[PDB]
Every structure is written in structure tokens, then in C-alpha cells.
Design a protein around this ligand. Structure first.
Ligand SMILES: C/C=C(/C)C(=O)O[C@H]1C(C)=C2[C@H]([C@@H]1OC(=O)CCCCCCC)[C@@](C)(OC(C)=O)C[C@H](OC(=O)CCC)[C@@]1(O)[C@H]2OC(=O)[C@@]1(C)O
Ligand SMILES: Nc1ncnc2c1ncn2[C@@H]1O[C@H](COP(=O)(O)OP(=O)(O)CP(=O)(O)O)[C@H]2OC3(O[C@H]21)C([N+](=O)[O-])=CC(=[N+]([O-])O)C=C3[N+](=O)[O-]
Ligand SMILES: [Cl-]
Ligand SMILES: [K+]
Ligand SMILES: [Mg+2]
Ligand SMILES: [Mg+2]
Length: 993
């Protein structure tokens, strides 16, 4: 019964045709179970290792290499040469690399925390119902509760279903529903209907929600919904349904794979256009089984040339290091890819209570009467420092610290706050921080009178453990609390009867101490306390009182106020009915007003400056709270989201207000409003979706269950360290130290990481660009010499990998937090850099293919002189022309080493070319990245151990002496620096000119 909250208890009982006294009959339970299922949330296992690994290989660039792995086995079947028996390793090499790049992906998916599992911690195993078969209450499994049966809850219980309250047995029922509102303050339910169909949870004061827990009371209700249909179940579905998109750079890599499967698959099928050479390339034969292999021989190589294999190995070690660095800045990053996505954060969404605020109620201000002379009234207003439940902070008057004992009015104010109070302050010794016991509102009063120290107790050298209640205990000594008139909704106050118990028995006078909502409490005050004396409450006096209350209840310091009053002559205890709470208001009559305390859940101190740093970095901060719009707006102005006098009508909304906008208007409201309050969890989810409809990389910061749907929908969920298990489970990063500042720290880290990532991606691709140029040129020449499919992998995996990874340690930009967030949808290579790598690509593609032709054209030892070299496939048959040379020499060791030597040296230089884009090396020192110089040496160190340690050069081929070969590797390997330099000089100076 969804719209139960808007219907009457009788109506809700009629809906399921159930008596409030008997409950559901056995058959009803049978039918309701069949119709509504079981009261539980469906679990979500997710991972099937088989289905997950088959998801790993559905990537295109691995599907092609996989395709290129089996095709390479076909290149192991020919029996033409003795080397073939050792050439079976070549498909095996590529396969185990596809396995390495596959394990590491699984290595990152293993730590999938189960959000639903964390969330299902909030469903109790048991539940108390009333059914027809028994008069006594039955304690049953909560999953066996159907809509429509009478349910019972009391203190401590975890609400088992979404329940419409029928009868409240206590004078009040008080519920903790932070699960759905993120607010720990206990809310006082009733049973009257809540007519608004579109009411949010915060307005459904006649409902109990599955997952929330009873802070106080005992009530009876009827189940409205169970299972998936409850409010917590809507949190569940959204958590299951939110599928995480891919990283902006992973998106850029995927479009690179699609275009690769285009240009490659259209090159190999365009070679057929130049089969003019295979018209009579045999002496009399044609194309057969052995001869058409050359078309797939150039296909398996063209694939490994374009694929930047080993790049994922580079980026993965890069991210793991950043994870460590951010973990030192107290940013614990659970997902490796979100390290980079963090750098382009456009908009940070943030919860208020517990995220931006300490979630510890604090008394900011207090006032007592100062003087009353006729129509003139003055007050002693004070303020109190400290943003937590600790008894730390001092009272001050006009920004100057003050001791409250000198104000007789403040002594009685502390006495009421300590005695009219069902709550205490515990120092959790394990956490090392003071915690509350009972209501936050009341603990605020406890922690207050500890700061005040009205009797000047020596509290400096106490133990932190018994500092907690040290000053309250002194007040408990002065007056014995006899009984309590509990809070009731009719009077919005509570009071406490007391006796002195020392000097001469109770011959000093019994007294009642009262706190509550100001208006109602003040109206029952006939006198006013001025220090020790009392005077009659008059028109001018109370207006002065109300006035300053109104000023505090609103505006820049929107506080909750409690009026504090005493009854100096309380009725005789034996003429007071303590059962009927309807009688308690007349007992709290003819009172002496004392003072007023103004309460607030204050901001964390690190916030306001963190916000400004986000502002300086072009990052918008949007508060999204389930707390009242008044309070949120008030916090935004201290935080600096809003200015102190800034007009906010158009830029703060409640969820209900937001739902009332046309869909169009809702999307732009997200673009201009920085405050959303009194929201249900789906709202935060929906607001992030709207911000992502502007292609804005958005984060979400929270600490509660109610934050989880948005924590998932955001590109980045950020969980408070002290936050809930379910919020951390849903987040990509956790703030270990609860510092909102460490978000700014993490952005600057991920910002500087994404910049270095672009480099070694460009550097790896610019290599693949030239490597593809190399193979295509060889095929057009008819010369397959000077390149091997197996050689390409090793170089990309190691020779290019190590400088690539070294480019990850580049010194970051100085004014890096002064730039706006990176645009999401621009390519790494686009305009002149395309030309720069397209030229340098073909220029290093021809330096490798030209390395063969030179060896055949001219060499001191190699080889001596011509064109028939292109027709080397005819050394076998047409031998009379190939005179003076053996036929085996065309696959000689030396020419392939040169093309590898220039490929290594060039890429050793293009690595320096990619130390920076568009800045000289004479101005950007290669030694500014000491790691980069290390990588270049170790890559060539492996290249000199690749040529001089027998097994390696056996595959790869012989090495040729320095004096006659290293002369020629520097034909382009060093001009490619000059070339890139010159092209770099152009885009830097000729651009603006
Ligand atoms: C060998 C690999 C590729 C990708 C390639 O060459 O094709 C173009 C191509 C499709 C792109 C181009 C390639 O341009 C060339 O043609 C280079 C010369 C080689 C020609 C082939 C035969 C000799 C990239 C590779 O060229 C350079 C100069 O690197 C740049 C860029 O790549 C990126 O932005 C990197 C993505 C992480 C892409 O325009 C890209 O198209 C896209 O959608 C992007 C956004 O990918
Ligand atoms: N933002 C806030 N700041 C401080 N205290 C708050 C608070 N919100 C609630 N409380 C305290 O949390 C309770 C939540 O009620 P409830 O049904 O959520 O009510 P409302 O938010 O006022 C109506 P609404 O739904 O439109 O937002 C309230 O009870 C007492 O203080 C309140 C109280 N009093 O309010 O008068 C008096 C009191 N004594 O002893 O007189 C004690 C309160 N208390 O909380 O212990
Ligand atoms: Cl509101
Ligand atoms: K997320
Ligand atoms: Mg919160
Ligand atoms: Mg409120």
C-alpha cells in the first residue's frame, strides 16, 4: 500500500481487511505471501569468474591479437626451414602476453565490495507481529512478514518493513532514520494522515521505514510494503542498477581500437589492389597455399605494429603508484582507474551532515536577561566555541573569553541544561574521541555545561575519560531529580522536578526545570529571572526575548533554540498525576524564564578553504542534503558555497520543489543551484545524472546509506572515513582523515597523473604509428627484411615500456591547480600534434625500412650493390641473375639488427621528444626526469644484452661491429630529434605569429 502515509489508520486497515486487534488470519498470510513475496532484499553476487574472463577478452584490440595468435600458429606449420622448429615460440609469445594483460584486469576486479551485502546489514532477522492464531505477540523471521499484518516495534528494534503507524503506546515514539535522511536526530512520529501524495520520507511522519531503528518508544503499526517495494529497497535497486561507465581515457583508447580495426582491415584488403607483382612472380606457377601465407604474414605483423601492447602494463603500474601517493595524503583509492578520472573532476557533489559537518550538535549561542527597567529590556548574549561533543572550547562575550560563574543567570541556565536532560557524554577510549549517549540535541546541552564550568570546578588535570561528565555531576549534587514529565507533542516541552537535599532537608524549596520550544515555553512564563532576582514578564520584555530568538532561528546563523525556564513554586508532588501526559502542561505553568540556547551541527574547519581551492581549480561544489533547506542554506554561507548576503532564491531547492519543476527546468536547476535540501536518496542519484548529462565528470562525497545511490552514479564516489560501511562499499575513494581538503589533494594528484599519462600514450602510439608505416613500406617494396613480428612485441613491451613508465615521473606543472578541469571529450592527438606524429611516424617508419635497403645498396662488409633485391623471392628459381651471392643472405642477420637498432635509438629519442610536447630540450632538460635517463639506458642495456648473449641474438640475429654500423643508425635517430625540435619550434612560435 504505497500511498498509506496519506490515508487514515482505519483506511489503511480496510485496505488489507485486517482487524487491529486480531491481525491477519492464516489464509490471509498465505495469500499475501503469494502476492507480495518475502520481506527481504535480493542479494547480488555479480561475479562469475567464467563470465568475467569472457568479458575480459571481448575487447577489440585483444580480439585482434587473439586472432593474430591463432593465425601465428598457422605460421608455425610450414616446414621450409630448420629455424622453423624454434619459430613455434612466436605465437606462444604473443599468447602469454595476452594472458599477462588479462590477469591484471582480473586482479583489479577481485576487490568488488558488495553494496547490497553492506546494505542488507540493515534488515533484522526477527520481527514482532500480531496474528489471528494467537493473542500473544509472535516473534517471527522478518522475511515472513507480509503487507497488511499488525506489527510491533519498541526501543532498540530495527524496523522490519515499511509500516504505517496505528497506535503509539509511549507518550512519544522517536525514530533514527539517518538510513534515509542522513540525519541522526531522532524524529517524533504521530499517526495522523500526511495528505500530500508527493510527500518525501522526511514528511511521512506517520510511517516507519524498514532499516530505521527505534530510538525510543513502543508503537503498533500495519505493514504497508515489504521487500523491494520499501524505501530501503529503492536504495537497493539503484545500487544494483547503476552500471559504471568507462574512464575518459579508456574511452579515448577504445575509439583508438575501433579505428585500428578499420585502417588495418582496409589495408590488408587494399594490398590486393597492388597484386600487380604477383602476376608472374613465380617462374610459371601462380598463387597457392604457400605464397598466400605472405598475405597473412603481413597481417599478423600489421596487427602487432599498431597495437600498443604493454601500454596497459605501463598505465597499470603508473596507477598503482599514484594509489600509494594518494594513500599517503589519506586518500584510500579502492579502484585503480578512478585515480586518473579524479583529475578531470568538473563538479564535486557533497552531503552535509557528517561530510561537511562534524555531525555533532553544538550550542553556538546563549543569552540571559541583563536588565529590565520598564519598557527597556537588555540581554547578556554569549557565544561558545567548539564544533564537537568534547568539553573543549570556551564561552566568550563580545569575542572575549569569559567565565560563566560570574553570571547568576548563566548558573541557572547550566543547571537546567544539566538536570532537564536524559542524556550524557561518553568518552570512547578506543576511538579516543567523546561520543554521545542519548539524544544529540540533549547531548549538546551536556557538552555545553562542561564548557561553561559555572562553579569553577578544577577540571584541567582530570582524566579525559572522567572529564566527560565532570561539570554536570557537580550540578546533580546540588539538586536531586525526583521524577520527569516526559516530552509530549501537545506542549513541545519537558520538565524535571527537583529537591535540594543538603542544608536543612528540603526546607530550601523544590523546583521544576523546563526546556522546550521557545514560543510555548515562554508563553507559560509569568516572571523573568534577572541574575538572582525575578521580575514579572511584560510585553516589552518578552518581545525583546522573542526578537533575538527569531534572529537566531533564521538568517546567517539559523540555529535551533530551546527556551530554559524554572517553576519556582511547583505543585505538591502528591497532587500531580504522572500518568496522563495531557496534564503535564498545566504543571509546567507560572514559570520563570531563564534563557535560551541556540544549537547547530557546525561545519568542519577545513571545509571553507577546501571549497575555495575547488573554486580556484574550476571545480563546482554542490551541497545535496536531506536536512532542512533553512539549515543547508545557512551552512552553505559559512562554507562559502553562498555569500553571506547573496540572494539564493533561484539557486537552492528542496526535493519536493525540484520534483515540481518541468523536466527541462530540472536539468538546468542542477546547472545553477548549489544547494538541494530535504531530498530522498534517489534525488542525489538523479542530480548527479543531470550533471553527467552535461558531460561533466562529477564526484559525490558522503557518509550515509542515503548517499549510496549517488555515490555509485557519480564518476567518483568519495566516502568519509568515519562514514558508514555501505557508503565506503559504494565509493571509489575513502577520506581516511575526514579532511575535505584531502579531496583537493587527490584531485591535484590525479590531475598531474593524467598529464603524464597522455605523454607515454602519445609516445607509445607514435611508435605504433611508425611501426605500421614500417611494415606497409616493406610490403610495397617486396622486401620483408628488417622486421619481425616477434621483435615488435619485445620492443613495445620493454624497450618502449620502460621510458613510457619513466614518463610517469615527470615533474608536474607549477600552476596546475589554476587551470580549469580538463575537457572530457577531446583527443590526445588532434591538430598539429597529429601532423607532428604523422610526419615523425612516417619518418621513423622509413628509417627502419631504409635501414635494410642501405645494407643491400652499400656496405663495407655487407653485400655491394640493386633493384632485384625487391624480387629476392626469385633468388630460388631465377638464379642466373642473382649471381655473386648466396640465396640465404636475403634473410641475413645484420639488416634486421640495424632496423631494430634505429627503432630502439629513435624511440629512445622520441621518448625525449615526448618528455614534453611543444617545449625544447635545450629548455626542458632531459635530466629534469632522472628516471627517464635511467630508463633509456636500461632499455639499451637490454639491447646490448640482447645482441651479445647467445640465445637472444639467435632468434633476433647476429650483431655487427660499431665502427661500421653505429655510424648509420645516427642517420635519422638523431635528426628525428632535430626534426621534432624544428616542428616543435614551429607550433610554439609560428602559432601566434
Ligand atoms: C597506426 C595507428 C593508427 C591509429 C593510425 O595510423 O591511424 C590513424 C588514426 C585512426 C588515428 C591517428 C592515426 O593517424 C595516422 O594515420 C598516423 C600514420 C599511420 C598511417 C597508417 C599506415 C601508414 C593517430 C593514432 O595518429 C597519431 C599521429 O598518433 C592519432 C589519434 O590517436 C589518439 O588520439 C590516441 C588515442 C589514445 C586518433 O586520431 C586516431 O583516430 C582516432 O580516432 C584517434 C583520436 O585515436
Ligand atoms: N536541525 C535541528 N537542530 C537541532 N535540534 C533539532 C533539529 N531538528 C530536530 N531537532 C530536535 O530533535 C527533535 C526531533 O523532532 P522532529 O519531529 O524532527 O521536529 P522538527 O525538526 O522540529 C519538525 P520538522 O519535521 O519540520 O523538521 C526535536 O525535539 C526537541 O528538539 C528537536 C525539542 N523541540 O523540538 O522542541 C524539545 C525537547 N525538549 O526536551 O523540550 C527536546 C528535543 N530533542 O530532540 O531531544
Ligand atoms: Cl525544508
Ligand atoms: K561511483
Ligand atoms: Mg551524512
Ligand atoms: Mg526540522
Amino acid at each position: 500500500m504505497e500511498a498509506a502515509h496519506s490515508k487514515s489508520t482505519e483506511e489503511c486497515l480496510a485496505y488489507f481487511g485486517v482487524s487491529e486487534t486480531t491481525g491477519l488470519t492464516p489464509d490471509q498470510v498465505k495469500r499475501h505471501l503469494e502476492k507480495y513475496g518475502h520481506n527481504e532484499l535480493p542479494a547480488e553476487e555479480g561475479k562469475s569468474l567464467w563470465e568475467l574472463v569472457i568479458e575480459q577478452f571481448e575487447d577489440l584490440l585483444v580480439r585482434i591479437l587473439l586472432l593474430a595468435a591463432c593465425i601465428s600458429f598457422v605460421l608455425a606449420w610450414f616446414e621450409e626451414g630448420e629455424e622453423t622448429i624454434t619459430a613455434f615460440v612466436e605465437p606462444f609469445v604473443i599468447l602469454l602476453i595476452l594472458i599477462a594483460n588479462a590477469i591484471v584486469g582480473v586482479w583489479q576486479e577481485r576487490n568488488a565490495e558488495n553494496a547490497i551485502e553492506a546494505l542488507k546489514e540493515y534488515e533484522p532477522e526477527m520481527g514482532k507481529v500480531y496474528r489471528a492464531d494467537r493473542k500473544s505477540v509472535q516473534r517471527i523471521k522478518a522475511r515472513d512478514i507480509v503487507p497488511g499484518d499488525i506489527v510491533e516495534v519498541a526501543v532498540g528494534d530495527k524496523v522490519p518493513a515499511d509500516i504505517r503507524i496505528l497506535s503509539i503506546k509511549s507518550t512519544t515514539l522517536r525514530v533514527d532514520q539517518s538510513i534515509l535522511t542522513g540525519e541522526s536526530v531522532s524524529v517524533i512520529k504521530h499517526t495522523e494522515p500526511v495528505p500530500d501524495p508527493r510527500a518525501v520520507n522526511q514528511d511521512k511522519k506517520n510511517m516507519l521505514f524498514s532499516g530505521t531503528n527505534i530510538a525510543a518508544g513502543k508503537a503498533l503499526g500495519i505493514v504497508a510494503t515489504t521487500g523491494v517495494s520499501t524505501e530501503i529497497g529503492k536504495i537497493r535497486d539503484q545500487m544494483a542498477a547503476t552500471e559504471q561507465d568507462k574512464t575518459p581515457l579508456q574511452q579515448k583508447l577504445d575509439e583508438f581500437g575501433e579505428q585500428l580495426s578499420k585502417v588495418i582491415s582496409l589495408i590488408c584488403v587494399a594490398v590486393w589492389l597492388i597484386n600487380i607483382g604477383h602476376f608472374n612472380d613465380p617462374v610459371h606457377g601462380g598463387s597457392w597455399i604457400r605464397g598466400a601465407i605472405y598475405y597473412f604474414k603481413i597481417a599478423v605483423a600489421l596487427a602487432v605494429a599498431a597495437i600498443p601492447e604493454g601500454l596497459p602494463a605501463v598505465i597499470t603500474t603508473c596507477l598503482a603508484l599514484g594509489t600509494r601517493r594518494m594513500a599517503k595524503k589519506n586518500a584510500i583509492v579502492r579502484s585503480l582507474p578512478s585515480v586518473e578520472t579524479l583529475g578531470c573532476t568538473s563538479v564535486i557533489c557533497s552531503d552535509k551532515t557528517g561530510t561537511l559537518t562534524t555531525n555533532q550538535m553544538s550550542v553556538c549561542k546563549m543569552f540571559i536577561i541583563d536588565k529590565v527597567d520598564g519598557d527597556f529590556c537588555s540581554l547578556n548574549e554569549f557565544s561558545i566555541t567548539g564544533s564537537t561533543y568534547a568539553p573543549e572550547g570556551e564561552v566568550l562575550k563580545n569575542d572575549k573569553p569569559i567565565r560563566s560563574g560570574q553570571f547568576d543567570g548563566l548558573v541557572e541556565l547550566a543547571t537546567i541544561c544539566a538536570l532537564c536532560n536524559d542524556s550524557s557524554l561518553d568518552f570512547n577510549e578506543t576511538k579516543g574521541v567523546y561520543e554521545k549517549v542519548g539524544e544529540a540535541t540533549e547531548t549538546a546541552l551536556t557538552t555545553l555545561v562542561e564548557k561553561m564550568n559555572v562553579f569553577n570546578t578544577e577540571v584541567r588535570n582530570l582524566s579525559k575519560v572522567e572529564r566527560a561528565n565532570a561539570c554536570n555531576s557537580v550540578i546533580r549534587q546540588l539538586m536531586k531529580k525526583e521524577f520527569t514529565l516526559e516530552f509530549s507533542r501537545d506542549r513541545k516541552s519537558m520538565s524535571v522536578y527537583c529537591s535540594p537535599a543538603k542544608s536543612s532537608r528540603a526546607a530550601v524549596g523544590n523546583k521544576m526545570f523546563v526546556k522546550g520550544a521557545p514560543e510555548g515555553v515562554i508563553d507559560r512564563c509569568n516572571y523573568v529571572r534577572v541574575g538572582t532576582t525575578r521580575v514579572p514578564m511584560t510585553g516589552p520584555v518578552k518581545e525583546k526575548i522573542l526578537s533575538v530568538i527569531k534572529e537566531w532561528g533564521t538568517g546567517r546563523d539559523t540555529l535551533r533554540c530551546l527556551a530554559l525556564a524554572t517553576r519556582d513554586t511547583p505543585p505538591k508532588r502528591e497532587e500531580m498525576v504522572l500518568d496522563d501526559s495531557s496534564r503535564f502542561m498545566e504543571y509546567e505553568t507560572d514559570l520563570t524564564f531563564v534563557g535560551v540556547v541556540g544549537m547547530l551541527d557546525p561545519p568542519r574547519k577545513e571545509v571553507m578553504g577546501s571549497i575555495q581551492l575547488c573554486r580556484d581549480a574550476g571545480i563546482r561544489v554542490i551541497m545535496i542534503t536531506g536536512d532542512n533547506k533553512g539549515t543547508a542554506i545557512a551552512i552553505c554561507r559559512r562554507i562559502g558555497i553562498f555569500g553571506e548576503n547573496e540572494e539564493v532564491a533561484d539557486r537552492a531547492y528542496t526535493g519536493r520543489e525540484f520534483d515540481d519543476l518541468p523536466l527541462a527546468e530540472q536539468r538546468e536547476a542542477c546547472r545553477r543551484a548549489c544547494c538541494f535540501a530535504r531530498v530522498e536518496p534517489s534525488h542525489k542519484s538523479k542530480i548527479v545524472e543531470y550533471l553527467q548529462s552535461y558531460d561533466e565528470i562529477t564526484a559525490m562525497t558522503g557518509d550515509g546509506v542515503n548517499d549510496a545511490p549517488a555515490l555509485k552514479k557519480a564518476e567518483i564516489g568519495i566516502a568519509m572515513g568515519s562514514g558508514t560501511a555501505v557508503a565506503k562499499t559504494a565509493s571509489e575513494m575513502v577520506l581516511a582523515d575526514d579532511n575535505f581538503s584531502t579531496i583537493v589533494a587527490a584531485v591535484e594528484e590525479g590531475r598531474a597523473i593524467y598529464n603524464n599519462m597522455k605523454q607515454f600514450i602519445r609516445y607509445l602510439i607514435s611508435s605504433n604509428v611508425g611501426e605500421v608505416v614500417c611494415i606497409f613500406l616493406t610490403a610495397a617494396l617486396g622486401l620483408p627484411e628488417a622486421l619481425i613480428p616477434v621483435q615488435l612485441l619485445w620492443v613495445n613491451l620493454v624497450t618502449d615500456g620502460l621510458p613510457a613508465t619513466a614518463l610517469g615521473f615527470n615533474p608536474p606543472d607549477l600552476d596546475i591547480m589554476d587551470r580549469p578541469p580538463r575537457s572530457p571529450k577531446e583527443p590526445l592527438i588532434s591538430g598539429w600534434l597529429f601532423f607532428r606524429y604523422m610526419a615523425i611516424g612516417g619518418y621513423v617508419g622509413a628509417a627502419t625500412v631504409g635501414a635494410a635497403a642501405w645494407w643491400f645498396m652499400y656496405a663495407e662488409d655487407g653485400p655491394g650493390v640493386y633493384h632485384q633485391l625487391t624480387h629476392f623471392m626469385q633468388c630460388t628459381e631465377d638464379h642466373p641473375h642473382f649471381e655473386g651471392l648466396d640465396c640465404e643472405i636475403f634473410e641475413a642477420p645484420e639488416p634486421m639488427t640495424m632496423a631494430l637498432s634505429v627503432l630502439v635509438t629513435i624511440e629512445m629519442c622520441n621518448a625525449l621528444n615526448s618528455l614534453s610536447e611543444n617545449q625544447s630540450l635545450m629548455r626542458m632538460p632531459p635530466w629534469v626526469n632522472i628516471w627517464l635517463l635511467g630508463s633509456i639506458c636500461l632499455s639499451m642495456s637490454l639491447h646490448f644484452l640482447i645482441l651479445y648473449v647467445d640465445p637472444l641474438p639467435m632468434i633476433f640475429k647476429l650483431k655487427a661491429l660499431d665502427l661500421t654500423q653505429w655510424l648509420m643508425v645516427l642517420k635519422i635517430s638523431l635528426p628525428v630529434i632535430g626534426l621534432d625540435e624544428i616542428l616543435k619550434f614551429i607550433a610554439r612560435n609560428y602559432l601566434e605569429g
